[PDB]
From a paper:
[name] acts preferentially on recombination and repair intermediates containing HJs to promote efficient branch migration. Novel structural motifs found in the domain, such as the acidic β-wing, the [name]-insertion, and the C-term extended loop, may contribute cooperatively to the specialized functions of [name] in relation to HJ.
Crystals were obtained in conditions that included either a phosphate ion or an arsenate ion. The structures of human [name] [name] complexed with a phosphate ion and an arsenate ion were determined at resolutions of 2.7 and 2.9 Å, respectively. The asymmetric unit of each crystal contains two [name] monomers (Mol-A and -B), which are bridged to each other by the ion (P1 or As1) shared at the interface.
Residue numbers in the entry: 1074 to 1194
The structure:
């Protein structure tokens, strides 16, 4: 039903912004520790107040039910727009964190439109 292209474009723009300090000579890289879990991305999006970041896309998710906002990211991974790798921390825990998939650049070029099915329950 509902077309979510502009939202995904911004989610993608956003995820990539928090990957480096783009600009100054040393384009130094973030993560794995500074990368987001899907859940932290949901929280941020749904302008939660446990959100790690509270700028960029913080407001944007306010018309989505948590359940849906979830399903949207699940989709964005599936669709290879966003992807997720594992990180192992010092206490030997495996944490799945998000990053762009080979499809992210596509959506940023108007070339893919993203549509979403709003689910109840």
């Amino acid at each position: 039903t509902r077309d979510v292209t502009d939202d995904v474009k911004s989610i993608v723009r956003f995820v990539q912004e928090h990957s480096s300090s783009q600009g100054m000579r040393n384009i130094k890289h973030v993560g794995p520790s500074g990368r987001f879990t899907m859940n932290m991305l949901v929280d941020i999006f749904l302008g939660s107040k446990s959100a790690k970041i509270q700028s960029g896309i913080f407001g944007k998710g306010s018309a989505y039910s948590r359940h849906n906002a979830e399903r949207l990211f699940k989709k964005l991974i599936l669709d290879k727009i966003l992807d997720e790798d594992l990180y192992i921390n010092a206490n030997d825990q495996a944490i799945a964190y998000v990053m762009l998939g080979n499809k992210a650049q596509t959506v940023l070029n108007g070339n893919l439109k993203v549509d979403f099915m709003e689910t109840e329950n």
